Amino acid sequence: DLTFRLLRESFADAVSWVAKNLPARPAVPVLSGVLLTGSDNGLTISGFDYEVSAEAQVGAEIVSPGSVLVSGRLLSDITRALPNKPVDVHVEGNRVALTCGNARFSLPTMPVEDYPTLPTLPEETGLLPAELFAEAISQVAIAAGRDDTLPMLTGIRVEILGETVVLAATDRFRLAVRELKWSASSPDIEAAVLVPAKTLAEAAKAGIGGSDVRLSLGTGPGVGKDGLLGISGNGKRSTTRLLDAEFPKFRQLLPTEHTAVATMDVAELIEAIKLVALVADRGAQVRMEFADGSVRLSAGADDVGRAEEDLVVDYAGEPLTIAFNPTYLTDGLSSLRSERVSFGFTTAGKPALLRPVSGDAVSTDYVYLLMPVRL
Amino acid sequence: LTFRLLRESFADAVSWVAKNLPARPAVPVLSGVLLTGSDNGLTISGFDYEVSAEAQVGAEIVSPGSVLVSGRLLSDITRALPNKPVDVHVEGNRVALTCGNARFSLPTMPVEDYPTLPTLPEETGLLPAELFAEAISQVAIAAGRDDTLPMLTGIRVEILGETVVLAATDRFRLAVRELKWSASSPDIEAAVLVPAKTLAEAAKAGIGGSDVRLSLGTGPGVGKDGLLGISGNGKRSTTRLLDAEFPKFRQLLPTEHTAVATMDVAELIEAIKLVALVADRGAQVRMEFADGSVRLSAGADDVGRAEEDLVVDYAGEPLTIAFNPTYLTDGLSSLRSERVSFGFTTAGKPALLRPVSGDDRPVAGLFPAVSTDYVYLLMPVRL
Numbered sequence: 157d158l159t160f161r162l163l164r165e166s167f168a169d170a171v172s173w174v175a176k177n178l179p180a181r182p183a184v185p186v187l188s189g190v191l192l193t194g195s196d197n198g199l200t201i202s203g204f205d206y207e208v209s210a211e212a213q214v215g216a217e218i219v220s221p222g223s224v225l226v227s228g229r230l231l232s233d234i235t236r237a238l239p240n241k242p243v244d245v246h247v248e249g250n251r252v253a254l255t256c257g258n259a260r261f262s263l264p265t266m267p268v269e270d271y272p273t274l275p276t277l278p279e280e281t282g283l284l285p286a287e288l289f290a291e292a293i294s295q296v297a298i299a300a301g302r303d304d305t306l307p308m309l310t311g312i313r314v315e316i317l318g319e320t321v322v323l324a325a326t327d328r329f330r331l332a333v334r335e336l337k338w339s340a341s342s343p344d345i346e347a348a349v350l351v352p353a354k355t356l357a358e359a360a361k362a363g364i365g366g367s368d369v370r371l372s373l374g375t376g377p378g379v380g381k382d383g384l385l386g387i388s389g390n391g392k393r394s395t396t397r398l399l400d401a402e403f404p405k406f407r408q409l410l411p412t413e414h415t416a417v418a419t420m421d422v423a424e425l426i427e428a429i430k431l432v433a434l435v436a437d438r439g440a441q442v443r444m445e446f447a448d449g450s451v452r453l454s455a456g457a458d459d460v461g462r463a464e465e466d467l468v469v470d471y472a473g474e475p476l477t478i479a480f481n482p483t484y485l486t487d488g489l490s491s492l493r494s495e496r497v498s499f500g501f502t503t504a505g506k507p508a509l510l511r512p513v514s515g516d517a518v519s520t521d522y523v524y525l526l527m528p529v530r531l
Numbered sequence: 532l533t534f535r536l537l538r539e540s541f542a543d544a545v546s547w548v549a550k551n552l553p554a555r556p557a558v559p560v561l562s563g564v565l566l567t568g569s570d571n572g573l574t575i576s577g578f579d580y581e582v583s584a585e586a587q588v589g590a591e592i593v594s595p596g597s598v599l600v601s602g603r604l605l606s607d608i609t610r611a612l613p614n615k616p617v618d619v620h621v622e623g624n625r626v627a628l629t630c631g632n633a634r635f636s637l638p639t640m641p642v643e644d645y646p647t648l649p650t651l652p653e654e655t656g657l658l659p660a661e662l663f664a665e666a667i668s669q670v671a672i673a674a675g676r677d678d679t680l681p682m683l684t685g686i687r688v689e690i691l692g693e694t695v696v697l698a699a700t701d702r703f704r705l706a707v708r709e710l711k712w713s714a715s716s717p718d719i720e721a722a723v724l725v726p727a728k729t730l731a732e733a734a735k736a737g738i739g740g741s742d743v744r745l746s747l748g749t750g751p752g753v754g755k756d757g758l759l760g761i762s763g764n765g766k767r768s769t770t771r772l773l774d775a776e777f778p779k780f781r782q783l784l785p786t787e788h789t790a791v792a793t794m795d796v797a798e799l800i801e802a803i804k805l806v807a808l809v810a811d812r813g814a815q816v817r818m819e820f821a822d823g824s825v826r827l828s829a830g831a832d833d834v835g836r837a838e839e840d841l842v843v844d845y846a847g848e849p850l851t852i853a854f855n856p857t858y859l860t861d862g863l864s865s866l867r868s869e870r871v872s873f874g875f876t877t878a879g880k881p882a883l884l885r886p887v888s889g890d891d892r893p894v895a896g897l898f899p900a901v902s903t904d905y906v907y908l909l910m911p912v913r914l
Contacts, residue, residue, distance in 0.1 A: 227834070227835070230808065230809070230834070230835060233808050234805070234808055234809070237801075237804055237805040237808060238805065258839055258840050258841070259802070259805060259806070259837070259838065259839045260837065260838040260839075261809065261835065261836065261837050261838070262835065262836040262837075263809075263835045263836075264833050264834070264835065427611075427613075428633075430611060431611050431612070431633055432633075434604070434607050434608055434611060435604070435608075435635070459638070460601065460604075460637075460638050461601075461604065461635070461636070461637050461638065462635070462636040462637075463633070463634070463635050463636070464633070464634055465632050465633040465634075466632045467632070
């Protein structure tokens, strides 16, 4: 009942996006599948699990309408490996015929009724330039520390205030808040919700074309407990369930006046961190020793090596000697899309403030809170 | 010991010696790189169970003497330093290292407790670094993978006059390479087995257009040193030889064919990766040679089925033959030729692949096959 024809690249691009974030999974077989729907004008490619859904619609010559359920990872891997010709697709009983140039395929099909029905639209709360979203999330997500660790509730907080968006991501060592200006598709609206880095970042990492990223949480009176978040892009559209966990109240953590402040060249600092960090322990510390006109960046191993570098800086205040985890600090410096950096600390046991200095519930546009280490 | 020299000259010569070194093996002293200064200048020296590396470079030797610092640590520092001259002097039990605004204080290990690097055998002959690098990458694939089967883990290296012949094999593929050589040596007839892991790596570290000296010896006592020297401009390494018997491989290769074929290489690699996406477990890919057209095909109990028809030249009775996807593909990459030649006998016996667009005559003196400088022999599969 289903027959379509489109360009290989378009079909490859559409599937990969629906079959990356959420699939790549064998948990329940009846759900490794991706749904192909042959609407009168285009092909829609659908997919989800129990929480995060994804949908892609692309141009097609659908000769016969209908739908079909085929292996997720497989189709992706196939469409990318196929020739740069058009591809023809026919469903024959419960097998799918797929021809692209001189290559034939036959894939086992799954029953179209077993597949869950996707989530809908939480009404458009507003939109913003995809480049901005790409940056915002890209910055903040550096701080929701999650690598080889168990995924403790790992989320980027998203707050809407009239037309002011605030993105906050933290673990417990670092806190990254970013502010954002918004074409808010509703009157002044207030919304503070939590949605896990995992997916959110990817929708943004898509690195969408233009000013078309479209945040769907509803225009209502706060989006309800229907834990949904829609991202809509140029044809690409994905929902994701939002966590029930509560974010810290970050405004608290941020100081107004800080006992001491200085500024230095980002590039140069990142090169010297990695320089002296080479000798840093498994208890990774790096010692910054602030004085007028200069900082003595040093680190050491309690056994095997010692390192130090004098760097120029514009310091001002009562000298501070303080240490950081070289990786969380360098994450910060990188996070700042700035040539130079503002440092705002209070005590060698109180958070230090990383702000971008591109000279010539938040404070400036990008703010980055870093916990110190002791001795 | 005190000396000065440029960051890059130091970095390059330390990371060359320290790459083969282990971060923390059984004996601590083996993790370290030996730094010696004399009339010649600074010398980077590293030893191992099986490889010894040594690099000589110019430095201003302010004070002769040797020292023992962590091999991998010194490599990491000298790479990260700002591009300014580096200063080193040994303070009692520690090394001070000064480059611009950065200063380092590394700890030493006891220097008397470092062995003397095994001595280089006489030069057996020499060949451009480039060929050496290609010939190994070519043959190294076929090397029997990490197993309790040593005979297969080696790369065989045999010298016949002005000809060198390189071989490797797991019991499923066999790769032979033939080179033109400059043996500064007379009769020169020898055969040796060296570990593929180490050889490949030592030949990966060979580029730029220069030459490379192979040192096993020259007399009847050739390769009998238990070592292989490979050296050039200041850089000198030896690798332990492998005491195992290599297979009598020349016998293994067919001399004539029931069926030959040729086809486009990049075209064939690409189509292989396509159909095998659907193959059982990367287990097999079925080729169906007819005249003019070969049907590449793959399947899986119930995962999917695939088919490509590729433009082949053929001569002989339409053979149908299964190969392993990966082994097949390695073989193809292993020829750096634009096209490929196929030699077959039965669906259950070896296929012989060689580069096509290559008019080198491996010259004589003392339906068919043919002469090539490189062959890759693949066993087939079924079910």
